[PDB]
């Protein structure tokens, strides 16, 4: 299949322009079958952004929002969905637990079907509950059962701090020596990303002593998308459980958790899934574990619905991940996530990933064409080894590139000493966004 | 001080009517300094309630909503508060984490001050996070540390199912025999409530072997309000930790968790606190434990704010209950709770408890006057031994009282075989509500 760089160059030829011409981005936007989804979101205006220098920008232009990997833009329908539940609460109060589009007792289950295609799992394998790191702990309390022979947790070095702290506290819970039991894979000297052959070597050599492998799906800092099925197979080959924090993977890369045989996973909803800060999180457990991996911590919402409200204190635990659901679900959080997932349903992950590959590929192409020496893309170059996000470093001692970018209405993340992350997302970022960004960047780098 | 029954009879004398006259309820409503708060809430109309028989009711009359102990009515300002955060998310997206009335990073801390007077604790002793039973588990993982000598958990028999399941799973986590380690105080033969002298006897006799006492503040089924400071002192006398599930206490009875020296507590926000189904829950840990009782499960939101976002993976744990906060807080849930707590701030728990004593006392008076033989109030009669809620049973073999009540727009809870709970709450229930309810009840009982 045609690589992004080649698509860009072929399109330019057809248009009779240079691949770096604005006309290429405009054409790609015209051909984008997902173009209409941008209208489904509230996009900030440049003049409203706190760090913006108004002298440097055109008023009433949209922001170039490349932070959708961290805090996803708002589906316009969030308010409408909230209003449905507020109106029910106003009109019938307590009766809302049992009636309506989203009966509160089953608020989570009413929309979980919309997650099936996003993570590649069945309805009984997915729970919508709590918060990401909270879910990580709930799962680890059942999946991490260390023995004298098999007691290690394997993860990447420089994991996201929350996961790092979670893993540390899990080890401390069992009185395990951290330095000996917390195995962290570091890159080779002079490299920032991990080589798959190196990960697999560690697993092959140390796997017998490892209880659980807990990796990110996409590493937050490098933008590296790890080979989930390869790590899963390798870990299970050595008798390890393999789970993933998919915070930067869900709604970004395509996922087949069930078919890949992943043991468990967890994710948040306020990044690529656009549900709003601190939104209701998610958990997956493969159905193969439904009768054998039981919740460590139980609440009444792990009791089967049909008899839960008998309140006879005779537990009837739901098999699989829903047995891990402790409390009644927050309807208001269900509302905002639901609005987002209806959009994902219409777009499809297949079509979104297709646009992403071309969009991020176009960004990479323009960067490398303009500065192919000063500018380094740390994110892996193989299209299958990254998602939306590129992590980029700069060697310009006199310029804080990030500061100059944010002053001009580019919303992205800082990488110290002198770099960005940027993640154009297919739902609401355009090829023209990418074109405009690269122009601002070039203008900054030229001084 | 004057008992409710005596207030009712004195008022009637002044009015020159019988204490059972409608004019007494109308007068009490006129004198109610909290009368205006009823306008702050969306009260269902009778015709909108699913089980209502329209032939039996007057259209456009308000429901008699006595289920505010289970799902509290909606503050009208919830929508407005949500809109503030949705507007910020629309306007500045990611920048909302750090700016505004409720910067998302500190969404919980921005409103925690409003809880101080409600639970009687300092800002560093209160966390707003997660869900009730979830918080119970987080606290028990740190407070329940069984030894061969001291391994029991003490609770009431027929505790709320979620707490029952939580306590059971906590015991199983340590491989403890449930029947031997789960000590449940049952009432004497022919009684439904517990005697304080009996609770204290169990504590005195068995206290040395008990690691944690975990009681409800108000028992959901009987409506009994336990003497929290007495149980706390008695338990600590024997070296036990004493914690409470305050789900039916917070926003109902007055609380002084800090001054009483309670070790820990947890509560929900969708009952008397009116925050909406599955709302953000609460946790208390006495400051005396801040440096000695550490979280079992850690996430990045337990790391001090000033260095959290350095993301260097070097934990700097916040002392006390905020060290137990694992994840970033849900802004949308913060919003709805905030709207409610502003109302509580204006009303004050002191004034609300005062109205409650008179209101529930008036309900009890009318019931007992009309049927002082057929009708039994299980809830303790001492004003200090109950909150808003009365639990009532009926001996009428041919009438399902609950069914007849709900058909007429009375919203309450069922008690099998033939009984209610009812909880008139001072924020939005009136003395006239109580009058109307008793009339419907009398009419039902007469047949
Ligand atoms: C309502 C109630 C619960 C409900 O638990 P959630 O965790 O909020 O679902 C738990 N415990 C008690 C004592 C209650 O009254
Ligand atoms: C953003 C992120 C988190 C944040 O954790 P919460 O529990 O949602 O506060 C955790 N882990 C990873 C890998 C992330 O990218």
From Swiss-Prot, chains A, B:
It catalyses: L-kynurenine + H2O = anthranilate + L-alanine + H(+); 3-hydroxy-L-kynurenine + H2O = 3-hydroxyanthranilate + L-alanine + H(+). InterPro entries: Kynureninase, PyrdxlP-dep_Trfase, PyrdxlP-dep_Trfase_major, PyrdxlP-dep_Trfase_small. It holds the Pfam family KYNU_C. Its main location: cytoplasm. Pathway: Amino-acid degradation; L-kynurenine degradation; L-alanine and anthranilate from L-kynurenine: step 1/1; Cofactor biosynthesis; NAD(+) biosynthesis; quinolinate from L-kynurenine: step 2/3. GO terms for molecular function: kynureninase activity; protein homodimerization activity; pyridoxal phosphate binding. This is Kynureninase. It comes from Homo sapiens (Human).
């Amino acid at each position: 299949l045609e690589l992004p760089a080649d698509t860009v160059q072929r399109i330019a030829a057809e248009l009779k322009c240079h691949p770096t011409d604005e006309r290429v981005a405009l054409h790609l936007d015209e051909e984008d079958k997902l173009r209409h989804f941008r209208e489904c979101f509230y996009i900030p205006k440049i003049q409203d952004l706190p760090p913006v220098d108004l002298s440097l920008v055109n008023k009433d232009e949209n922001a170039i929002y490349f932070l959708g990997n961290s805090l996803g833009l708002q589906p316009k329908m969030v308010k409408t969905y909230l209003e449905e539940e507020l109106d029910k609460w106003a009109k019938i109060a307590a009766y809302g637990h049992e009636v309506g589009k989203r009966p509160w007792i089953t608020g989570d289950e009413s929309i979980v079907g919309l997650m099936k295609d996003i993570v590649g799992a069945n309805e009984k394998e997915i729970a919508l509950m709590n918060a990401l790191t909270v879910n990580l702990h709930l799962l680890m309390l059942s999946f991490f059962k260390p023995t004298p022979k098999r007691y290690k947790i394997l993860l990447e070095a420089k994991a996201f701090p929350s996961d790092h702290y979670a893993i540390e506290s899990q080890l401390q819970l069992h009185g395990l020596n951290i330095e000996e039991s917390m195995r962290m894979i570091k890159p080779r000297e002079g490299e920032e990303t991990l080589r798959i052959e190196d990960i697999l070597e560690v697993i092959e050599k140390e796997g017998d002593s490892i209880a659980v492998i807990l990796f990110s799906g996409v590493h937050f800092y490098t933008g590296q998308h790890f080979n989930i099925p390869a790590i899963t197979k390798a870990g299970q080959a050595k008798g390890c459980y393999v789970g993933f924090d998919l915070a930067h993977a869900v709604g970004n890369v395509e996922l087949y958790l069930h078919d890949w045989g992943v043991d468990f996973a967890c994710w948040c909803s306020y990044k690529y899934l656009n549900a709003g800060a601190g939104g209701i999180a998610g958990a997956f457990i493969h159905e193969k574990h439904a009768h054998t991996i039981k919740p460590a911590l139980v609440g009444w919402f792990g009791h089967e619905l049909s008899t839960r409200f008998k309140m006879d204190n005779k537990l009837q635990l739901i098999p699989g991940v829903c047995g891990f659901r402790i409390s009644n679900p927050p309807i208001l959080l269900v509302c905002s996530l639901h609005a987002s997932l209806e959009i994902f349903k219409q777009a499809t992950m297949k079509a979104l990933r297709k646009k992403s590959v071309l969009l991020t590929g176009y960004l990479e192409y323009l960067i490398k064409h303009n500065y192919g020496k000063v500018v380094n893309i740390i994110t892996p170059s193989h299209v299958e080894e990254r998602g939306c996000q590129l992590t980029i470093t700069f060697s310009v001692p006199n310029k804080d590139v990030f500061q100059e970018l944010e002053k001009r209405g580019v919303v992205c993340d800082k990488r110290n000493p002198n770099g960005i992350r940027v993640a154009p997302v297919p739902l609401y970022n355009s090829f023209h966004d990418v074109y405009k960004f690269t122009n601002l960047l070039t203008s900054i780098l030229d001084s």
